[PDB]
Amino acid sequence: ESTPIQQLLEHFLRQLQRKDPHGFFAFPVTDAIAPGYSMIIKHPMDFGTMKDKIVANEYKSVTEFKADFKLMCDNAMTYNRPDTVYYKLAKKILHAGFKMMSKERLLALKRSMS
Ligand SMILES: COc1cc([C@H](C)O)c(OC)cc1-c1cc(C(C)=O)n2ccccc12
């Protein structure tokens, strides 16, 4: 049975995943496909890793989940040059996700749950 934090973060996760219809953030980037990746990016992150943390009930807060989401986007904006599809999408998704997960929207949602 889903815990309250699992419900909440799964909700956000699925909203965020719909901003990425080609699945460029669905699973991890690797050196095989992105030369130098693990030398440049210390803490890699992707929606699939976030999903496993939720399914495992390993998140302690919405803050932590937001910190992973931001990590994923910051990694994409660090590794990839401004000119690329991945940089530009990371930027839209980042802006979109912080709006979707604002304090007020989170407050409205937590009130209606329990
Ligand atoms: C690893 O995520 C990707 C997945 C796919 C397909 C949908 O499987 C993909 O196809 C063009 C690209 C990426 C991908 C994602 C990223 C990112 C997010 O940095 N990236 C950087 C350099 C080269 C590829 C990628």
From Swiss-Prot:
Species lineage: Eukaryota, Metazoa, Chordata, Craniata, Vertebrata
Record's comment describing the protein's domains: The Bromo domain mediates interaction with histones that have acetylated lysine residues at specific positions. Also recognizes and binds histones that are butyrylated.
Localization per Swiss-Prot or TrEMBL: Nucleus
Residues of the Bromo domain: 1-103
Protein name: Bromodomain-containing protein 9
Full-length numbering of the shown residues: 137 to 239 of 597
Top-level taxon of the source organism: Eukaryota
Task of the protein: Plays a role in chromatin remodeling and regulation of transcription. Acts as a chromatin reader that recognizes and binds acylated histones: binds histones that are acetylated and/or butyrylated. Component of SWI/SNF chromatin remodeling subcomplex GBAF that carries out key enzymatic activities, changing chromatin structure by altering DNA-histone contacts within a nucleosome in an ATP-dependent manner. Also orchestrates the RAD51-RAD54 complex formation and thereby plays a role in homologous recombination (HR).
Residue numbers spanned by region Histone H4K5ac H4K8ac and histone H4K5bu H4K8bu binding: 78-80
Organism: Homo sapiens (Human)
Oligomer status and interactors: Binds acetylated histones H3 and H4. Binds butyrylated histone H4. Component of the multiprotein chromatin-remodeling subcomplex SWI/SNF called GBAF, which includes at least BICRA or BICRAL (mutually exclusive), BRD9, SS18, the core BAF subunits, SMARCA2/BRM, SMARCA4/BRG1/BAF190A, ACTL6A/BAF53, SMARCC1/BAF155, and SMARCD1/BAF60A. Interacts (via N-terminal bromodomain) with acetylated RAD54. Interacts (via C-terminus) with RAD51.
Site (Histone H4K5ac H4K8ac and histone H4K5bu H4K8bu binding): 33, 86
